[PDB]
Structures are given as structure tokens and as C-alpha cells.
């Protein structure tokens, strides 16, 4: 009959937007049977009055779907906690678009949860991936420690041992904390030269201040940083010739929420003409069952996708997170951000311009030293010593 | 580049059976799903059949219940019409359509084929 | 359902603009989406405008399409041309084809 779509935006631009991609969506394949209304409602602050809302002001409404996004002002303040929360517990699938914490990749804690955006560990995947382009092998993973830090050491931990391969002294140090000089400095003494970090902001400044300090950053090294580790203090605490990362569109809300409403529209018209059909609950209070079709919505959510839109090519993977993402590996040149390479899938590719590496020498630098002051360990007894 | 060729049509005797086979070439198989639709002499087209990315998402025209049936295997880019209990109405030509998405309730196509003739009468 | 309406044929003399309609039986012309199909005469035919005024890759502008809802009708729009496009044009909705009307240039 009639369906609807509700959907936590961020502001009334991006409202507006939505209501006129579901529109467009209705204007395409409408041959009666469906109708594909849409709902919507505003962020708040605070987090009850934001569950109450959502609670009320859209299972009111027997919502087929949620839609939600990034607070605009803030950065954390108002993550999508509780709408996952309050709409997982009627398993009523819900779909982030532009929120990437890695925290909502296992459905242990969020039962209906999937995404279009690669969290943060296809980062390390990358970080793989490249490391055999310019072959080098022996690195040392600098990493912070509190949910991010594990989930990044254990998928690259994961795909490292493949080729039978092991990383040097792994190294964790606990968020925010001052003085990691004698970690640093206890890294500095080793046969391996590139490092790779995988750490907040403001720990990212301090251990770029603390290297510098240790005169770590000069030449014959090689850096390696996500893409929260630059762009945020980028242009104040980093070194040259550091190569970092980016998602090609990442904040480009009105893109992403046009392909999300694709998306869902195909997939609920696809799983209509099925025998066991059954309607959302109606109201939050009264009702403590959970949508029987519910997870099978899911399963046709998932494996379907593959609407072709103007982010390219859509496919959830096994586990929610979107697969098959385009990043764009920069560089800081004189305090700037040039482009030397895109990564599309499974390859990387060079550009037409060179690379500065950390201290301006031009070449490709291999990173090993072979000490030659080995340390002997022998013990008192007989003849022999 | 985009290149859509078909064959497998021609002339028969009624109550016999035949099968369709449109391959393609260059552009991905699994990515796209493609339609079935007819031209008739003199006047225009009318809607047959069409698939899904993969399977599942079917539909068939009106009046071509049981009589016809749709198929394709992924393997070597290749789409098999088959058909049966043929008449005398449907001797015309059969299209080669690809669509646009990877679901055919768009209903919208591009790159056509280049036709294929059958015929069935004494 | 409904049944697209069109003129059976038009005759133009080269350097004159035309304009061709297909009119809609009964819904909405602005419910569902059109689209404008083109071919010469054995060959296959070929799509030259899809989304009401959206022009496909190698379009050489020209053809201009009208989504004017006025009788419940659509109608595309050529300048003044006549080179070898003359040839019989449809229009698609859903489910459902048109006559074809057929651009005859004057000789």
C-alpha cells in the first residue's frame, strides 16, 4: 500500500534533499503497488531526548528503514548511538552514511547496522597492499590502544601473516597521554626504518612533537598515516615527506543520500512480491516483539545493492561495511597537499609527479640497517669459558 | 567497447520449440541485466521479458504466460531465451536489449542488438 | 493501463525547426518518466533521449525534449536540419510503445 522511509539528517538543506531524492525514486518505477512516502526529523543534542524523539516521532509511522548521519557542529558529541540502539531492538534495519568508527562493524552490539562508507581498517588493507609496491618488509606499528588501535593491528596482523611474513615490535600506548619519549625512543634503537601510525588527532600532533624532538623524522625514514592522522593538524605539527591517505568523496552528504534512497527503494520493491510479509510495529509502547520479516529484510538488503549511482558501484559485504572504496594516497610538499596516487581495487597506481620522501632526498629509500653490534650471551663453565 | 550480438532465430513449423542465444562483448556481464522485446512489421515494439543482476527479480509480459521462459549463466557472457508451443502471431523479429541498472524495473534501455528473424507457418 | 498517441507521420522541408508529441491516455504525464528512441531503416534502433531532457554520450545537442505537461503529452523539439536524419521516431514510458511517426525530409 504505503511505505515509508524515516531518516535523521543534519540540517533543513539536506531535509529537503532527501524528500526530493525519494520523490525522483517515485517518479522512477511506479507502476502502482507502492507509493514510498517518505519521513524525516531534525539531529538533537543530548542523547535521551534524542532516543525519546526517534522513538516516537518515527515508529509512529511503521518506518521501513533509518536513515542517519554525521552532527553537523560537533565530531563525536552526537554519534549514531541511539538510533542504532533503539531501532536494532525491533530489528528494523537502519543505514549510516557517513560514519566511520569500526566500533559498528561486528553485529555482536548492533543487530541491524550496514553502511557506505570503509571504516578505518581497509586503511590498513591499503597499508598492505602498497607496502609491496615499493617492497619493502621488515615495518614497526605504532599504534594507539582503546578500540580503533586494536581492531587496525589485528586486520593488518591478519593479512600480514599470509605471506608467512611478521612485523617488528609492535607497540600500543594509551590515549591521551604526554611524554611517550621513552617508548619513541625505545623504537628508535631497531633494524627497521618505516613506520606506520594509526592514532587520534591531538595523539597524532604529540608524537609527530616527540619524533621531531628525537630527530627520528630526518632523512633514510618513511611515514605512513591515516587519514585522521593529517588533514585535522596537518599544516602546524607534521613532517615532510609524510604520505597519508583520503576517501575521494567521504563528506558529500547529498551524494550518498541519494544513493542510500536507491538503494533501499530497489531493495524493498525486490523483496515485496515475497508470501511472508509483515508490517513494522506501530507505536513504542505496548508492543515487545520483534518484526518477524525483519531480518530477512536484511539478507535482501545486503547481498542485493549494486544500484550503479553516481558514487559508483555499491555492494555491501559480509559484515555491513561497504567494500570497493577509491582512495587517494597525498603528500605534504612545502607545507602542501599534493596528489601522487589512486588506489581503485586490489592495484595501486602512480601519477606523472615525483615524490619527496622525509628529508627531501630523491630516490626510494629501503628501510634496514643490520646493526653489526650483536650482543653475546655465554655462561661460566669448564674448559670452555 | 559495447557490443551486443544475437543469434539463434529463424523459421520452424508450428508446435515446435526454439532457443534464443545473445552473447556479448567488452563490457562487464554480471554488473548489467538486460530485457527481451520484439519488433513487429509495421508497427512498433512490445515488451517481453526481463532479468535481474543475477536472478530472483523476474517478470514476464501479459500475454506470454508459460509459453516463453528466461535465462542466463554468467560464465561466458551469454543470455539463452527458451520457448515453446510457438504461433503464428509472433512471426516477427526479437530484439536484443541491455539495460542500464542492474534491476529492470528502470525499464529503460540502451545498446541495442541487431535483430533476429523467426517465423513460424506451413 | 493507458495507450501513447501519435501523429502517424510529419513532413519537413530542410532548415525548419519541428516539434513531435506522443500524448499520454490517462495518468500523469509528469507520474512516470519518458523516453526517446531513434532508427534507420535496417538498423537497429537506438536510444537518443533517456530522462525527459537528458542527452546520452555523442548527442550532438540539437535534440531538445519537452516535458511540458499541458494535455498530458511530451514532445521533443529539432532545429533546422535535414542531412540523412530522417527517419521514424518512438517514445517510451512503461510497458508501453507508440506507432512511430515517421520525419520525412522534403525533396
Known amino acids: 500500500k504505503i511505505v515509508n522511509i524515516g531518516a535523521v539528517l543534519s540540517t533543513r538543506k539536506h531535509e529537503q534533499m532527501f524528500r526530493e531524492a525519494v520523490n525522483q525514486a517515485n517518479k522512477r518505477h511506479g507502476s502502482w503497488k507502492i507509493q514510498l512516502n517518505a519521513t524525516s526529523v531534525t539531529h538533537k543534542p543530548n542523547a535521551i531526548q534524542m532516543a525519546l524523539s526517534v522513538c516516537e516521532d518515527l515508529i509512529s509511522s511503521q518506518v521501513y528503514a533509518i536513515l542517519v548521519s554525521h552532527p553537523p557542529t560537533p565530531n563525536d558529541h552526537f554519534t549514531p548511538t541511539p538510533v542504532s540502539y533503539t531501532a536494532g531492538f525491533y530489528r528494523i534495519p537502519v543505514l549510516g552514511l557517513t560514519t566511520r568508527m569500526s566500533i559498528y562493524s561486528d553485529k555482536s552490539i548492533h543487530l541491524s547496522f550496514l553502511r557506505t562508507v570503509p571504516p578505518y581498517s581497509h586503511q590498513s588493507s591499503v597499508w598492505f597492499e602498497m607496502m609491496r609496491v615499493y617492497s619493502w618488509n621488515h615495518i614497526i606499528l605504532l599504534v594507539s590502544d582503546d578500540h580503533e588501535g586494536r581492531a587496525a593491528q589485528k586486520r593488518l596482523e591478519t593479512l600480514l601473516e599470509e605471506r608467512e611474513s611478521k612485523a617488528e615490535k609492535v607497540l600500543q600506548f594509551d590515549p591521551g597521554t604526554k611524554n611517550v619519549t621513552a617508548l619513541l625512543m625505545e623504537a628508535k634503537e631497531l633494524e627497521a626504518r618505516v613506520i606506520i601510525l594509526s592514532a587520534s588527532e591531538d595523539d597524532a600532533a604529540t608524537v609527530y612533537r616527540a619524533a621531531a624532538m628525537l630527530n627520528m623524522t630526518g632523512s633514510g625514514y618513511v611515514w605512513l598515516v591515516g587519514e585522521r592522522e593529517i588533514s585535522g593538524n596537518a599544516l602546524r605539527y607534521a613532517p615532510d615527506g609524510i604520505l597519508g591517505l583520503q576517501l575521494i568523496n567521504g563528506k558529500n552528504e547529498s551524494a550518498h543520500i541519494s544513493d542510500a534512497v536507491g538503494v533501499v527503494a530497489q531493495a524493498v520493491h525486490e523483496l515485496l512480491e515475497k508470501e511472508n510479509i509483515t508490517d513494522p510495529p506501530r507505536g513504542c509502547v505496548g508492543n515487545t516483539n520483534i518484526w518477524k520479516t525483519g531480518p530477512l529484510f536484511k539478507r535482501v538488503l545486503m547481498s542485493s545493492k549494486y544500484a550503479d549511482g553516481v558514487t559508483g558501484r555499491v555492494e555491501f559485504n559480509e559484515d555491513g561495511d561497504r567494500k570497493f572504496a577509491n582512495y587517494s594516497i597525498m603528500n605534504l610538499q612545502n607545507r602542501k597537499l599534493v596528489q601522487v596516487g589512486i588506489y581503485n581495487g586490489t592495484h595501486v597506481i602512480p601519477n606523472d609527479r615525483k615524490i619527496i620522501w622525509p628529508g627531501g632526498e630523491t630516490e626510494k629509500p629501503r628501510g634496514y640497517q643490520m646493526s653489526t653490534r650483536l650482543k653475546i650471551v655465554t655462561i661460566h663453565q669448564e674448559p670452555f669459558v | 567497447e559495447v557490443q551486443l550480438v544475437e543469434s539463434g532465430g529463424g523459421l520452424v513449423q508450428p508446435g515446435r520449440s526454439l532457443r534464443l542465444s545473445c552473447a556479448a562483448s567488452?563490457?562487464?556481464?554480471?554488473?548489467?541485466?538486460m530485457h527481451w522485446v520484439r519488433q513487429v512489421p509495421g508497427k512498433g515494439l512490445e515488451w517481453v521479458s526481463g532479468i535481474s543482476w543475477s536472478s530472483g527479480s523476474i517478470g514476464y509480459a501479459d500475454s506470454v504466460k508459460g509459453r516463453f521462459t528466461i535465462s542466463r549463466d554468467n560464465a561466458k557472457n551469454s543470455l539463452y531465451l527458451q520457448m515453446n508451443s510457438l504461433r503464428a502471431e509472433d512471426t516477427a523479429l526479437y530484439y536484443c536489449?541491455?539495460?542500464?541498472?542492474?534491476?529492470?524495473?528502470?525499464?529503460?534501455?540502451?545498446?541495442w542488438g541487431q535483430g533476429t528473424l523467426v517465423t513460424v507457418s506451413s | 493501463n493507458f495507450m501513447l498517441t501519435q501523429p502517424h507521420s510529419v513532413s519537413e522541408s530542410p532548415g525548419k525547426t519541428v516539434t513531435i508529441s506522443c500524448t499520454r491516455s490517462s495518468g500523469s504525464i509528469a507520474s512516470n518518466y519518458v523516453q526517446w528512441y531513434q532508427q534507420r531503416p535496417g538498423s537497429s534502433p537506438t536510444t537518443v533521449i533517456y530522462?525527459?531532457?537528458?542527452?546520452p554520450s555523442g548527442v550532438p545537442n540539437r535534440f531538445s525534449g519537452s516535458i511540458d505537461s499541458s494535455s498530458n503529452s511530451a514532445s521533443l523539439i529539432i532545429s533546422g536540419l535535414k542531412t540523412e536524419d530522417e527517419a521514424d521516431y518512438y517514445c517510451?514510458?512503461?510497458?508501453?510503445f507508440g506507432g512511430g511517426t515517421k520525419l520525412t525530409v522534403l525533396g
Open positions: 517510451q514510458s512503461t510497458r508501453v
Open positions: 567488452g563490457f562487464t556481464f554480471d554488473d548489467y541485466a
Open positions: 536489449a541491455k539495460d542500464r541498472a542492474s534491476s529492470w524495473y528502470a525499464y529503460g534501455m540502451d545498446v
Open positions: 530522462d525527459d531532457n537528458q542527452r
